[PDB]
């Protein structure tokens, strides 16, 4: 099972460690994607996790969006975790450097609750643009279900664990 995590909440975990090496080790029954509404898995989490399918999610995820057009801002849509885990719940947060609604943070967290135990980045961080302080809070007030946080980002872990109220 997952290891060396830090216990935040009665269902919150914590690990500093790279998502894609973390989803090989484990290969969790959901990983999830830190996805755009078009399913382009360019960069940061989504384009580390597509880059260790061999690019297998983006031709997936290009049918998927050729059947179903694109996913809302706060929303999401599981397809195969390929190499990685059983299901990506490709999860779409507010990108604040496109003048997203960060209020819609809440809605993407929303999504996590329909599935018992997930391997997870923080919403809507990195290259997305909101504050991971703030994310990790709308996660543990809003996840009810099990969710084991991988942070890339060691500096990063620190200062949210050393902050976390
Ligand atoms: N937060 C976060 C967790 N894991 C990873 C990244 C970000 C980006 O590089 C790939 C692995």
Redesign the pocket.
């Given at each position: 099972s997952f290891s060396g995590y830090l216990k935040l909440t009665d269902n919150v975990y914590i690990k500093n460690?790279?998502?894609?090496?973390?989803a090989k080790k484990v290969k969790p029954t959901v990983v999830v994607n830190?996805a755009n509404v078009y399913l382009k898995h360019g960069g940061?989490?989504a384009?580390?996790?597509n880059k260790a399918t061999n690019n297998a999610m983006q031709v997936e995820s290009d049918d998927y969006i050729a059947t179903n057009g694109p996913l809302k801002v706060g929303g999401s849509c599981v397809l195969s975790g390929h190499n990685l885990a059983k299901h990506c719940l490709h999860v779409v947060g507010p990108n604040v450097n496109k003048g997203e609604d960060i209020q819609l943070l809440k809605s993407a967290y929303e999504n996590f609750n329909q599935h018992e135990v997930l391997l997870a980045?923080?919403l809507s961080?990195?290259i997305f643009g909101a504050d991971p302080i703030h994310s990790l809070r709308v996660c543990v007030d809003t996840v009810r279900t099990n969710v084991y946080l991988?942070?890339?980002?060691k500096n990063?872990y620190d200062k949210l664990v050393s902050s976390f109220l």
């Open positions: 460690a790279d998502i894609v090496e973390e830190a940061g989490v384009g580390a996790l980045p923080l961080a990195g991988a942070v890339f980002d990063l």
